[PDB]
Every structure is written in structure tokens, then in C-alpha cells.
Scaffold this active site. Structure first.
Site, short mmCIF file in Angstrom:
data_model
loop_
_atom_site.label_atom_id
_atom_site.label_comp_id
_atom_site.label_asym_id
_atom_site.label_seq_id
_atom_site.Cartn_x
_atom_site.Cartn_y
_atom_site.Cartn_z
N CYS A 40 32.27 32.35 49.53
CA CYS A 40 33.19 31.59 50.38
C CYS A 40 32.41 30.63 51.26
O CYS A 40 31.62 31.06 52.11
CB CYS A 40 34.05 32.50 51.26
SG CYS A 40 35.34 31.53 52.10
N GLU B 206 37.70 21.58 45.07
CA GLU B 206 38.42 22.56 44.25
C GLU B 206 39.51 21.87 43.45
O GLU B 206 39.69 22.12 42.25
CB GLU B 206 39.01 23.69 45.11
CG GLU B 206 38.03 24.35 46.12
CD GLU B 206 38.68 25.46 46.98
OE1 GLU B 206 38.90 26.59 46.46
OE2 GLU B 206 38.96 25.21 48.18
N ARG C 280 33.61 30.30 55.57
CA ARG C 280 33.57 31.48 56.42
C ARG C 280 33.31 31.18 57.89
O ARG C 280 33.40 32.10 58.70
CB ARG C 280 32.54 32.49 55.91
CG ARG C 280 32.97 33.21 54.65
CD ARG C 280 31.94 34.20 54.25
NE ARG C 280 30.86 33.58 53.50
CZ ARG C 280 29.73 34.20 53.18
NH1 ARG C 280 29.54 35.47 53.54
NH2 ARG C 280 28.81 33.57 52.46
N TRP D 131 42.85 26.95 53.42
CA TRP D 131 43.21 25.59 53.03
C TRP D 131 42.15 25.12 52.05
O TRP D 131 41.11 25.75 51.89
CB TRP D 131 43.35 24.67 54.26
CG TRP D 131 42.16 24.69 55.14
CD1 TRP D 131 40.99 23.99 54.95
CD2 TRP D 131 42.00 25.41 56.37
NE1 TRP D 131 40.12 24.25 55.98
CE2 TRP D 131 40.70 25.12 56.86
CE3 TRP D 131 42.82 26.28 57.09
CZ2 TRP D 131 40.21 25.67 58.04
CZ3 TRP D 131 42.32 26.83 58.27
CH2 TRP D 131 41.03 26.53 58.73
C1 HEM Z 1 40.23 28.26 55.37
C2 HEM Z 1 39.37 27.58 54.62
C3 HEM Z 1 38.70 28.14 53.34
C4 HEM Z 1 37.91 27.42 52.55
C5 HEM Z 1 37.53 25.94 52.74
C6 HEM Z 1 37.47 28.27 51.46
C7 HEM Z 1 36.64 27.86 50.46
C8 HEM Z 1 36.28 28.57 49.33
C9 HEM Z 1 35.77 28.03 48.07
C10 HEM Z 1 35.53 26.54 47.76
C11 HEM Z 1 35.53 29.05 47.25
C12 HEM Z 1 35.01 28.95 45.79
C13 HEM Z 1 36.27 28.98 44.91
C14 HEM Z 1 36.15 28.61 43.44
O1 HEM Z 1 35.55 27.55 43.10
O2 HEM Z 1 36.72 29.37 42.59
C15 HEM Z 1 35.91 30.27 47.95
C16 HEM Z 1 35.84 31.56 47.48
C17 HEM Z 1 36.33 32.68 48.12
N1 HEM Z 1 37.01 32.68 49.32
FE1 HEM Z 1 37.22 31.20 50.73
N2 HEM Z 1 38.02 29.52 51.64
C18 HEM Z 1 38.78 29.49 52.78
C19 HEM Z 1 39.51 30.55 53.27
C20 HEM Z 1 39.38 31.83 52.83
C21 HEM Z 1 40.04 32.99 53.39
C22 HEM Z 1 41.05 32.90 54.56
C23 HEM Z 1 39.64 34.06 52.68
C24 HEM Z 1 40.01 35.56 52.85
C25 HEM Z 1 40.47 36.02 54.01
C26 HEM Z 1 38.68 33.60 51.69
C27 HEM Z 1 38.02 34.39 50.76
C28 HEM Z 1 37.33 34.00 49.65
C29 HEM Z 1 36.82 34.84 48.60
C30 HEM Z 1 36.93 36.38 48.52
C31 HEM Z 1 36.21 34.06 47.71
C32 HEM Z 1 35.54 34.55 46.43
C33 HEM Z 1 36.66 34.51 45.40
C34 HEM Z 1 36.10 33.90 44.14
O3 HEM Z 1 36.00 32.64 44.06
O4 HEM Z 1 35.74 34.69 43.23
N3 HEM Z 1 38.57 32.23 51.81
N4 HEM Z 1 36.35 29.93 49.20
C1 LIG Z 2 41.85 31.53 50.32
C2 LIG Z 2 41.08 30.50 49.54
C3 LIG Z 2 40.47 30.86 48.34
C4 LIG Z 2 39.78 29.87 47.62
C5 LIG Z 2 39.12 30.19 46.30
C6 LIG Z 2 40.19 30.03 45.20
C7 LIG Z 2 39.81 30.63 43.85
C8 LIG Z 2 39.99 29.85 42.71
C9 LIG Z 2 39.66 30.35 41.45
C10 LIG Z 2 39.86 29.48 40.22
C11 LIG Z 2 38.53 29.24 39.51
N1 LIG Z 2 37.81 28.12 40.12
C12 LIG Z 2 36.84 27.63 39.14
C13 LIG Z 2 38.71 27.00 40.44
C14 LIG Z 2 39.16 31.63 41.32
C15 LIG Z 2 38.99 32.41 42.46
F1 LIG Z 2 38.51 33.66 42.31
C16 LIG Z 2 39.31 31.92 43.72
F2 LIG Z 2 39.14 32.70 44.81
N2 LIG Z 2 39.69 28.61 48.11
C17 LIG Z 2 40.26 28.29 49.29
N3 LIG Z 2 40.14 27.00 49.72
N4 LIG Z 2 40.96 29.23 50.01
CL LIG Z 3 42.35 26.78 43.28
#
Ligand code: HEM
Ligand SMILES: Cc1cc(CCc2cc(CCN(C)C)cc(F)c2F)nc(N)n1
Ligand SMILES: [Cl-]
Ligand code: HEM
Ligand SMILES: Cc1cc(CCc2cc(CCN(C)C)cc(F)c2F)nc(N)n1
Ligand SMILES: C[C@H](O)[C@H](O)[C@H]1CNc2nc(N)[nH]c(=O)c2N1
Ligand SMILES: C[C@H](O)[C@H](O)[C@H]1CNc2nc(N)[nH]c(=O)c2N1
Ligand SMILES: [Cl-]
Ligand SMILES: [Gd]
Ligand SMILES: [Gd]
Ligand SMILES: [Zn+2]
EC number: 1.14.13.39
Lengths: 402, 400
Positions: free
Chosen positions: A106, A283, A109, A278
């Protein structure tokens, strides 16, 4: 003993002492690194719970106090009596924040402490579940001024099946396999789309059809729920200076709400705890729209831009992707919907890294997920060595219910 | 056996070659350090295994000369301690170490490597004319060719051949009355030593540094590279006429002169290898890294971009045009260059070849994915496994 971590932009060096406390084990060995892979009992319930309660009483400066040792005894007594235990509300709020704080992939964070926790552990049915979710969407969306939120449904417990949200996000676009093997809509949602139709969803035929929710209450089949149209805030995509761009008819939704992860807190498992934040523009712009296995619009944009798509050394891909991202940020800002760009996002992650280094002595970070998918070395996280490890509380992947 | 997935297509392979990992890496079940840049009778065991490789690769496992070659290195080490490789072994091993470099995206070319044998070298003047033959051979008036020049291996009690430069071509790094550097900040230190050892500093951002060469137990001696030998490319942009006026330049030959080649337990601390550039190496890292030439903002001012808000994506816009200039300039100069799309696509092809050949390929995702447009290239969507095989190139302590 502790990994030394260099920042190559600044020359800085730190040591990640927090890595030493890694509560579980990842997929690498001294033989072989698998960092790049996407998917890597009363006794041991007690120890996980003990560690978590110890963390909680650390965070309120009541380590080793009367109230601390009473809570430890209370949990042991309850584990002995029932096989599980219940979190207090303040422990739940703390545990959900920690899980976000500990999520290594993430980049968002810096915000971990401003998380809104909705306690839905008294939820009773798929219908009450759907109501809780609608209110989460409504609160988090907040008319475009997005707010981070998590809704925590009842824990996994002996005797009962799980609450589950079958959808991977609360808002997803249908993916309609068509007759050859070409997907109309989002190809990542082909499977969940079929499940919806198999459960009686009347499908559409657009590229941006919002999917219904498939919601599973314990020991029940999944039940289908339509999201009210005016709860799903969406953003038509236009480009600030390429005016044919709006004729592509592209759209995306305001709210990224991940709905298929398991939240783990002190040994307890919450198979349903949707969280939302958000978007970062890459993404939507780079990944969701240009990934060859997603909407895959890159060449169609490059052709419209009159880029020479017959050689790669013209860098038509890079040029077209940059404008797609421009269009996403402009469109969201026009619509007055929260959005962060990968430069702003990675700069604030650097501040997060510095805050966490002072607070806990390090920070779990998965470089390949933290570095944006375009313009990587233009952001400061590219030049920051990172240490990836698993802290609990945590969000974890879980198998699809079907 | 690690399951490895390609997300673009959905295909699965298994890295069975990982099972043979030699020099264990930095990662443990508890923490991953994949992102970190820098993580005697045992000589026989490493010598044995390399010979076993060599004869397996020429369809001669357990036949005549294989058994015989085992005894000679037995005898050579039994008598003297170290041992010498057959000239082809030096060649086969110089190529395997390229083929094993997990951070090299250009490994599709591994089989076409030209090995110059310099094991009979004796001093800084001899080196200098070896290096010079390499440079002119590899440069080849801009039609670049992969070359490695191997200097004598190491044995105890005596010194070490070393090139004190990280590469054969480097630009100067001049500090100032205020710390900030004119020239290349990644070389600043090797500039301090070159000036210290007699070199007259220039005043330019692209002064080619001398060549601090050192022979066993002997202090380094500067060498001034012949200006006709250093093929360079002035950077111009096909449609932005002012880019040329920025007076930017890069060199043609990427020649890594500080890594330790290691074959069958033998250590060649001087074995400079050279290939040709990928355009992002020059355009994105060398010129745009905040601690390198750091030109990104200057190019954006010239393009009239809004550097006031990050959300204009001015950094991305200026970086693509810098890379375009690099590709255009090298092609106009008739100097071998490859873009990150063509290069990453060849690597995919190399992964598929290495899969059917060796049952896998050691690959460092963070270094195979290019520093711009990462997910626009196919390597991004390819899970990879990183591990250490021998023969290999290794990082080594700086000489001083
Ligand atoms: C508020 C602004 C936030 C931004 C800009 C953000 C951004 C991101 C991004 C860019 C990823 C990689 C996603 C991908 O490419 O698949 C990610 C992963 C993740 N985010 Fe955040 N997130 C936000 C909020 C949150 C919140 C509120 C939570 C949980 C309370 C969270 C939990 C996670 C988790 C667990 C992952 C790993 C999931 C995964 O991609 O396997 N995020 N986040
Ligand atoms: C709360 C939140 C979560 C995320 C990440 C979204 C998210 C997206 C994918 C799709 C695969 N990816 C290559 C696009 C897989 C994931 F496990 C995942 F968590 N982003 C933002 N901004 N907020
Ligand atoms: Cl997404
Ligand atoms: C012919 C075309 C070649 C291309 C396009 C190419 C490109 C690259 C690139 C982009 C890297 C990234 C690492 C970095 O920039 O620090 C790299 C690393 C590396 N390459 Fe190649 N290279 C080529 C030839 C060679 C040759 C001929 C050799 C040796 C025989 C070689 C051995 C290595 C090694 C050992 C590394 C890792 C060194 C390090 O990262 O510090 N490469 N190459
Ligand atoms: C033969 C060859 C090698 C290379 C890689 C160049 C290289 C670069 C660095 C650090 C500088 N980098 C971050 C800009 C360290 C290295 F060990 C290294 F080998 N490339 C190309 N094309 N050919
Ligand atoms: C194979 C590769 O590790 C995989 O595609 C990863 C790379 N980095 C990523 N980074 C983010 N943010 N999201 C992703 O899905 C991925 N995918
Ligand atoms: C911290 C991170 O691992 C580090 O900056 C690496 C990432 N990838 C790289 N890739 C190349 N080619 N060169 C580098 O210096 C780096 N740096
Ligand atoms: Cl370089
Ligand atoms: Gd226009
Ligand atoms: Gd002007
Ligand atoms: Zn690892």
C-alpha cells in the site's frame, strides 16, 4: 542482524529493526527470492491474541498495567471457555488501523491513522449486510470528497459459516465473454460476471456495466443485490487537450473498495471486512485501462494521437499512456472526485517511511508494488531500498468462496 | 519447485533450475531483501562443477576428454593450488556468467559473446592496449559487438589486476565552492582520485575521465583514452530544435570494468565486459536520476510544461522526450541502441528459450522491468525467480 537500507537519491541509510519481529513467514529463502510473486488451535490463538493485546496496550501507554493483565486473563479465560474471544470496540478500531499500517503493498499508508471503522459485527443476514455496505459506500464516497473507511462484519467463529462478499471490489464493471473469446467490458471480472448471471442477474451489454453484489451470510447461498445507481459515483473520462478522447466513451468509478480480503486481528479472522480509500491515477490510467489483459486501450489511443505505431522506438506506448493518465487526473479533478497522482502519492509514502522509521524502527514495503507502473525512477520510492515482511494485524488474501 | 505465472496471458511455468542455486542470497522466510542493490581446497568443488557444466553443454557428458579434464584440474590444484582453464572453458564460462546475470535484460544475446583472452597480461601498459583493443573492437564505428576482455585470475601472495573505474567511459564529477557538482555526480569520487594522481581537470559536464589502471602490488597509473577511440553521440531531438542547444552528450560503449568474473572457483577481478545500451539506461537513469545529471526539470522548462503541479505529469512528459532524443540521436549517429519495448520483448523470448533449455531463468524483476513505462512492457506481468548460479559476475570491494 537488522537489514541496512539505503536511499540512493539522498544517500541516507537506516536499519530495519522492526523486520526482526515478523510474525509470519513469506515465500523467499536464501536459495531463491520469490518477491515478485503476486500470491506468495487454542495454544496459537492465545499467543497471537497475547501479542495483539500487548500491542494495543502499548499504543495507549498502559503496557504492564492492571488493565493490561486483566485483559490478558480475560482473553485466556474466554479462549478456554468458548475456543475464541471477542474484541472490544477500541481494540477493533486499533486492529483495523494497524492492518492498513502493516500492508506492504500500500503506497497510501501515510493516511493509516485517519481510518473510519464501522463495526458491523452484529450483522445478521445478507440483507443487513447489504445495508451496512450501502452506508459504507455512501460515507466513503461523500459526494466526491472521498473518506477512508472499513466495515467489519462478524468474525469467523466455530459452528457457523463465514460472511463473505463474493465480489473482489464493491464496484466492478461486468466482463462479458463473447462468442469467440474476446471480452466486452472488464476482462478481470469475467468469472464474477458469470456467477452474477448464474444467480439471476439480468446482464447488460456495455463496457461499463456496474456489477451487482453477491453477498453470502453464514451457511446460506450467495444472494444478489443491485447497487442503487445514485450510490455509484462515476467519472466520464475526457482529456484536457485531446477532444476526441471523450468520444471513446471511457468511464471509471470514484470508489476503490476492496471487498475480498481477510482482516486478521489477534488471531481472529474477519473474512468480510470491505475497505475503501481513493484512487491513485496510475491504477486507473496505466493498469485498469492499458494492461493488455484489461481494457487494453493503448494502441487505439496511440492511433488517434497519430503516433507512429509501426516502430517501438518512437515510444508511442509511453506517449499514449502518459496522456491516458493526464485524462484520468483532469477528469477526476473536473468531476471534483478525490484523486492522487503517482508523484504526490510516492512523495507522501516517503514521509510515511520516515514517520514509521522513527515510531517502530522500519516499515514493511513491497518495492514492486510501491513503485508506480509508469515513470518509476522519476518517483522517490524507486531509489529507496525496502524490506518486505508480514506484520499482524494484517489484510490477507483468501480463496474465492466458489 | 516455484510456480511462476505470466499475468498477461495466464500461462504457468515451473522454475526447476532454481533448485541448483549456489551462492545463497539475502532473503529469508522472515523478510525479503530483493530490492537491495548490494545484498582454500573448496576451489576443487567449484572447479569440478564448472567442468561438469562444460562437457554437458557439448553433448559429451561422461566421455573421454571429460574424465581426463577432471584429473588435470585435480593435479593442477593438487600441485600448485590454483589452476588454469582451457581457452574454450574461459569462453564457455564467460558466456554462462552473462547467461546467469539475473539483472541483465539483454541476455537474449548471451551466446554471441566475443571473449578476448588476456590471461598473459603483465602491467598497466599491457592492460591499456588490451582495453584499447576491446574498446575499438566493441565500438566498431558504432556497430556495437558484445565483448569481454579477461585479465589474469587471482592467486594469493601477489597483488590484483583492477580497473579503478566502474566503467571504461565515465564523465567527470567536479565539486564546487558550494558542494553541487558540474558533471556526473556518480563519478565525483573517481574524479577526485584521477585529479589526485596527476590528471588536469577540465571545466565541462562531459569530460571523459582518464583510466586509473593498476597491476599487482603497484600503485595505479593514469591513462588518457584516445579521443578517436571514445565514440560519443551528441543528443538532439527530432522535433524540438532547442534540445541540441542543451549541449547534452552520452557515450556509445557501456563497458563494465569493476565486476569480478568468477568461473569454476577462479576470480578475475579485471574482466571488463561491454554490450550496447538500452535507451532508458541513458535517457532515464543517467540523465534524469535526481543524483545523476538531474536534467528533468530543465527539459520541462524548455517544453513550457507546468512544473508547478505534479498532476500535470510534466516529469513523465519530459522523460519520454528525453528518451526519444536518445533513441533518435544514436540512430542518427548509426550507433547500436535498443529501446525498452524491443529489449523487454526479447527478454520474454529469452525466458521461453531458457525455459525449454535449462528449465528456468534467474531474473531480478526490479532490474528487468525498465525505469519508465514498466507495466507497458511484458516483463512487468511476468513473475520471476531470483537466485545465484555459477559461472557468475559478482560485485567486489572497491580497489582503494
Ligand atoms: C486512501 C488512499 C489509498 C491509496 C492511494 C492506496 C493505494 C494503493 C495502491 C496503488 C495499491 C496497489 C494496488 C494494485 O496495483 O493492485 C494498494 C494496495 C493495497 N492497499 Fe492501499 N490505498 C489507499 C487506501 C487504502 C486503505 C484505506 C486500505 C485498508 C484499510 C488499503 C489497503 C491496501 C492493501 C491491503 C493493499 C494490498 C492489496 C493488494 O494489492 O494485493 N489501502 N494501495
Ligand atoms: C482501498 C484501496 C485499495 C487499492 C488497491 C486495489 C487493488 C486492485 C487489484 C487489481 C489488480 N491490479 C493490478 C489493478 C488487486 C488488489 F489486490 C487490490 F487491492 N487501491 C486504492 N487506491 N485503495
Ligand atoms: Cl482497481
Ligand atoms: C548486448 C546488450 C545488453 C543490454 C541491452 C544490457 C542491458 C542491461 C541493463 C539495462 C542492465 C540493468 C542493470 C543496471 O543498469 O545497473 C544490465 C545489467 C547487467 N548486465 Fe547486461 N546488457 C547487455 C549486455 C551485457 C553483457 C555483454 C554482459 C556480460 C558479458 C552483461 C552483464 C550484465 C550484468 C552482470 C549486469 C548486472 C550488473 C549490475 O546490475 O550491477 N550485459 N544489462
Ligand atoms: C554490458 C552492459 C552493462 C549494463 C549495465 C550498466 C551498469 C550500471 C550500474 C549502475 C548505474 N545504473 C544505475 C545507471 C551498475 C552496474 F554494475 C552496471 F553493470 N548495461 C548495458 N547496456 N550493457
Ligand atoms: C508479476 C508481477 O510481480 C506482478 O504483475 C506485479 C508487479 N507489480 C505490481 N504492482 C502493483 N501496484 N499492482 C500489481 O498488480 C503488480 N503486479
Ligand atoms: C531500491 C531499488 O531496489 C534500487 O533503486 C534499484 C532498483 N532498480 C534498479 N535498476 C537499475 N538498472 N539500476 C539501479 O540502480 C536500480 N536501483
Ligand atoms: Cl550506464
Ligand atoms: Gd486539441
Ligand atoms: Gd520559448
Ligand atoms: Zn526475496
Amino acid at each position: 542482524k537488522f537489514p541496512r537500507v539505503k536511499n540512493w537519491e539522498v544517500g541516507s541509510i537506516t536499519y530495519d529493526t522492526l523486520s526482526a519481529q515478523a510474525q509470519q513467514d513469506g515465500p523467499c529463502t536464501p536459495r531463491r527470492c520469490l518477491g515478485s510473486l503476486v500470491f506468495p488451535a487454542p495454544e496459537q490463538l492465545l499467543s497471537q491474541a497475547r501479542d495483539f493485546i500487548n500491542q494495543y496496550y502499548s499504543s495507549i501507554k498502559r503496557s504492564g498495567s492492571q488493565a493490561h493483565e486483566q485483559r490478558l486473563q480475560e482473553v485466556e479465560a474466554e479462549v478456554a471457555a468458548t475456543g475464541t474471544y471477542q474484541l472490544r470496540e477500541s481494540e477493533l478500531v486499533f486492529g483495523a488501523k494497524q492492518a492498513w499500517r502493516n500492508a506492504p503493498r500500500c503506497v497510501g499508508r501515510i493516511q493509516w491513522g485517519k481510518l473510519q471503522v464501522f463495526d458491523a459485527r452484529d450483522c445478521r443476514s445478507a440483507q443487513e449486510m447489504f445495508t451496512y455496505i450501502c452506508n459504507h459506500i455512501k460515507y466513503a464516497t461523500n459526494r466526491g470528497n472521498l473518506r477512508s473507511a472499513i466495515t467489519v462484519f462478524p468474525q469467523r467463529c466455530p459452528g457457523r459459516g463465514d460472511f463473505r462478499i463474493w465480489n473482489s471490489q464493491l464496484v466492478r464493471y461486468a466482463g462479458y465473454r463473447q462468442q469467440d473469446g474476446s471480452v466486452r467490458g472488464d476482462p478481470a471480472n469475467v468469472e464474477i460476471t458469470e456467477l452474477c448471471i448464474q444467480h439471476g442477474w439480468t446482464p447488460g451489454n456495455g463496457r461499463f456495466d456496474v456489477l451487482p453484489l453477491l453477498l453470502q451470510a453464514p451457511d446460506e447461498p450467495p444472494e444478489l443485490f443491485l447497487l442503487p445507481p445514485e450510490l455509484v459515483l462515476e467519472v466520464p473520462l475526457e482529456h484536457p487537450t485531446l477532444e476526441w478522447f471523450a468520444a471513446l466513451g471511457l468511464r471509471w468509478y470514484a470508489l476503490p473498495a476492496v471487498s475480498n480480503m481477510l482482516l486478521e486481528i489477534g488471531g481472529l479472522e474477519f473474512p468480510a471486512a470491505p475497505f475503501s480509500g481513493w484512487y491513485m491515477s496510475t491504477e486507473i490510467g496505466t493498469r485498469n485501462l492499458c494492461d493488455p489483459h484489461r481494457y487494453n486501450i493503448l494502441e487505439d489511443v496511440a492511433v488517434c494521437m497519430d503516433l507512429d505505431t509501426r516502430t517501438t522506438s518512437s515510444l508511442w506506448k509511453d506517449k499514449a499512456a502518459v496522456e491516458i493518465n493526464v485524462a484520468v487526473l483532469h477528469s477526476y479533478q473536473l468531476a471534483k472526485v478525490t484523486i492522487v497522482d503517482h508523484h504526490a502519492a510516492t512523495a507522501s509514502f516517503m514521509k510515511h517511511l520516515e514517520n514509521e522509521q522513527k515510531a517502530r524502527g522500519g516499515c514493511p514495503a513491497d518495492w514492486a508494488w510501491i513503485v508506480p507502473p509508469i515513470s518509476g525512477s522519476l518517483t522517490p520510492v524507486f531509489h529507496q531500498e525496502m524490506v518486505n515482511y508480514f506484520l499482524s494485524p494484517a489484510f490477507r488474501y483468501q480463496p474465492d468462496p466458489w
